[PDB]
Design a protein around this ligand. Sequence first.
Ligand SMILES: [Mg+2]
Ligand SMILES: [Mg+2]
Ligand SMILES: [Mg+2]
Ligand SMILES: [Mg+2]
Ligand SMILES: [Mg+2]
Ligand SMILES: [Mg+2]
Ligand SMILES: [Mg+2]
Ligand SMILES: [Mg+2]
Ligand SMILES: [Mg+2]
Lengths: 63, 96
Amino acid sequence: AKKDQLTLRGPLYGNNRSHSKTITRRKWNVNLQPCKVKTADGKTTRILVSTRTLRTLKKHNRL
Amino acid sequence: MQRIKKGDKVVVITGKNKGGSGIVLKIMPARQQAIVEGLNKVTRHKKVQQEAPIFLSKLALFDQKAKQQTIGKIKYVMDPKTNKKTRVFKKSNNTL
RNA sequence: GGGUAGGUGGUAAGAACCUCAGAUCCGGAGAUUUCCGAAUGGAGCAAUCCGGUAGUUGGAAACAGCUAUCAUUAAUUGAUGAAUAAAUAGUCAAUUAAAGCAAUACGUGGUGAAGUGAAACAUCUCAGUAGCCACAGGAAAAGAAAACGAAUGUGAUUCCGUGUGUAGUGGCGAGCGAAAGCGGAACAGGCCAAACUUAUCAUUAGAUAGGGGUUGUAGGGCUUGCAAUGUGGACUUGAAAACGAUAGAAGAAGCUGUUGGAAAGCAGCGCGCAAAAGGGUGAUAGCCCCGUAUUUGAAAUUGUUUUCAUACCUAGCGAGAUCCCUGAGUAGCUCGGAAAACGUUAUUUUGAGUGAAUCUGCCCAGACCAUUGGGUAAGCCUAAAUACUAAUUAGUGACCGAUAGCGAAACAGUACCGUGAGGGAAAGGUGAAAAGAACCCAGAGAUGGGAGUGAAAUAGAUUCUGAAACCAUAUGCCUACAACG
RNA sequence: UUGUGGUAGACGAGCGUUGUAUUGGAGUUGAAGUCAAAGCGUGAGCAUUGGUGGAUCCAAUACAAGUGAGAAUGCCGGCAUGAGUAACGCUUGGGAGUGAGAAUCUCCCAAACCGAUUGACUAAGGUUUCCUGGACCAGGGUCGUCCUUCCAGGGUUAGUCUGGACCUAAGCUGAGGCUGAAAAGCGUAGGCGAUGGACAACAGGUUAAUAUUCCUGUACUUACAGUUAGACUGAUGGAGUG
RNA sequence: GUUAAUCUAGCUGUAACCAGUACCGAGAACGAACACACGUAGUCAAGGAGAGGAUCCUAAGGUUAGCGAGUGAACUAUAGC
RNA sequence: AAAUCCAGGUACGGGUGAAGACACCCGUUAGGCGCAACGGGACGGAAAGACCCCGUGAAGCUUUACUGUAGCUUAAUAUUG
Ligand SMILES: [Mg+2]
Ligand SMILES: [Mg+2]
Ligand SMILES: [Mg+2]
Ligand SMILES: [Mg+2]
Ligand SMILES: [Mg+2]
Ligand SMILES: [Mg+2]
Ligand SMILES: [Mg+2]
Ligand SMILES: [Mg+2]
Ligand SMILES: [Mg+2]
């Protein structure tokens, strides 16, 4: 699954409304990056996490 | 109960036979038939005088305790104090 | 428990028995419940094959009987344990949940066409329709205002009518089409986070379990007093009662005559009614029967409601003051898109980026600013009205009546076609009752002709009626030199 | 008095059907439906009598509709015509018997094709078609006493054969895991998967039908204990062979 | 493993499970809508002449090609000339 | 058995005719009914003409026809010092 693991925010499906307004179905994929994390039992883990939650992790100092 | 039980006397109210008093032998309650001995003897041609069933509507019980051995209806409502359900004639009081 | 006197399911007579010490039958509750199948010991060509483990029995032992257990995954608990010393991954064990099916229906959510319309066509419509997929549920979803929106105003949601085919929106074409307001069905609003306080965690807590507190004419906490013992339910356990659902019991009243095969008709004289709804009975029955109206009744299981007690939750008016709290990668802003009636626009959502404030606040009243006015997001929960009926029961029809009506009145999704998905038919009626036509003649026999039963055998098993096309026979008339819709 | 041909097409008045409602009424002394007849109407249509048939039905006024058939290379069923025409899809002669009936069946004797086959053994398939007795609705391109059809009864017998209980190939599945809006896809360990590898039985006889299976005669194998003697065995792993 | 397990050779005794096994294997049982001239893996494969499984005739064995009987015109096919 | 078939008691010449006649007009010829044959005709039968044209019809294919797009490549921004 190309959704992240902390939350489950998945792709968003929309239209590729070009000039002259021809419609074409298209997908938006979340930005996934392999940044680490540290749990409160040790067990440092590597999880595919999206960037929006990466910022939240960065400010709550969960690394 | 049942208005007609095996054994009791019974007569015919309608049909080719009138006042054909006789005894009942078998009753098929599912299909509403009776087999009265001495009545409706059809000459079977087997490749014999076996009887022919008579529908329970035609049959009617036979009073035998009244001087006029006439024909009448039946009550069940009489449950005698020292007895179970019994048959008693409406236009009389004669058990069975 | 009911309930009587027969019964051993239909094509079904006979044979052999059970039964009126109360069987069969009907209703409630139970037990048994081979094998496959989510299939789950391991396999597998579905309904078969091959086992392990622990007991017990037999056996000298392989081995065979007879029992129970043996899948995976997630959570929790315990044990064990790596590269590496500790630790985690992993492995083993124990306990508790589901995995599937279907009511072709209804609900939500994801994804999502085309035919067609535009008299072509791409924007658009068909359409967020069908289909695929996940997920439940007895209903779901939604929901208690950062609202409507123009006012001395309404005061959660949902659903019906109207507003109206309006304001608007649309290659301003085809087309699309609200939100207010109003009349109605139904009506309930509750609870956390955080301030503060308590106990404990090498208390580095920034964590665990308590108290407390729930918001807008702003509220709550912090300091201090008064009044309270009570309604209230979105709700736990018991007891009692009522009304039902699941078998059933009683349940009035008629004879005579004629046609007649049989009268229940027709006719004469009666009769009963909280019953003249219906079905059968040799032809059309109020009184022959079975019921119906009515009156009734449950050991056992189950439903709705009510009452009494029973927990948990829940209660009110004031005084002090720069005290503290009032949901952060959040609301916004930008780039691409969409829900909303709106083809992107206030409002609402978001894949990418950036990013605030804290009651003198924040958002809102179709770009926007000021004034005025309304409401307090960024946390959760919620019965009712609403949608649907494959199912159980009672019943209805100016609905069909065997080329109809469900594809299917019968052993129909059968036979049959196809490798397979899948496609997919036709046909019923003797008579009131077999009294299913013993016997005789012909014939090998089916069968036929007499007989016989019966009202009728032109009702005969080819079985209600029995047209037409069609094929044969026959009285009567015409036709073999004649060109003929 | 003036008119009355007529498709497309406008307008008017009407017949019939099925059922519901109320009102009258006929019916086993024979209802509807069905045929037949030398009737009545301006038309759609409507009576009368008789045979058959064996229980429902007719008229008056409104009402409601699955409401009116000669055509759709219409659908379903039946029936003709073409026609007793083409066809009948590789082969004979007779004796005796049976039987009501024989070219067609049973037996016999020839005759004619096959013979790297129309013969004999089996795999794949098919699923009782096999054997005995009986029958002649239907099927058999004729007939039939007969059929591979139908009916009643019957037959398939393994330590060694084909396959499991042993093995693996292509490949299939696939715990954890990887990837993917969803379903699913990929794939490791394990597990399956013969067309192949490894494993011990020969000859003859018998029944209507079975046969390395049953029987007779002679054999081998793989396990299990108990026993005598000898010897220290030596795998879930390494190697050789296969 | 020795205070004997396990194997080897022999003797006595015991056991050897599950499905298939008929018949057809095609000018009539299979796939061709059929009792249709077509198709379908492998095996055995006699004698004379012959290089031979070719070719002609026969054997072991097996079949009567499930409509006949005539006539011997046109005409058609097939052979012969 | 079959395809066919508006009912049929289904002549020929000249002419006419929706323009080439079994039926019409005017002449001509011909007893009723089969059987074997052969094919001139009945614009014979089988096929809603394949050619052609028409439809604001379909599909396949092409391209420097239009509009878009899977891919490939380039820059800003996040991942990120
Ligand atoms: Mg404004
Ligand atoms: Mg002919
Ligand atoms: Mg001929
Ligand atoms: Mg011929
Ligand atoms: Mg062949
Ligand atoms: Mg072969
Ligand atoms: Mg040879
Ligand atoms: Mg040869
Ligand atoms: Mg033609």
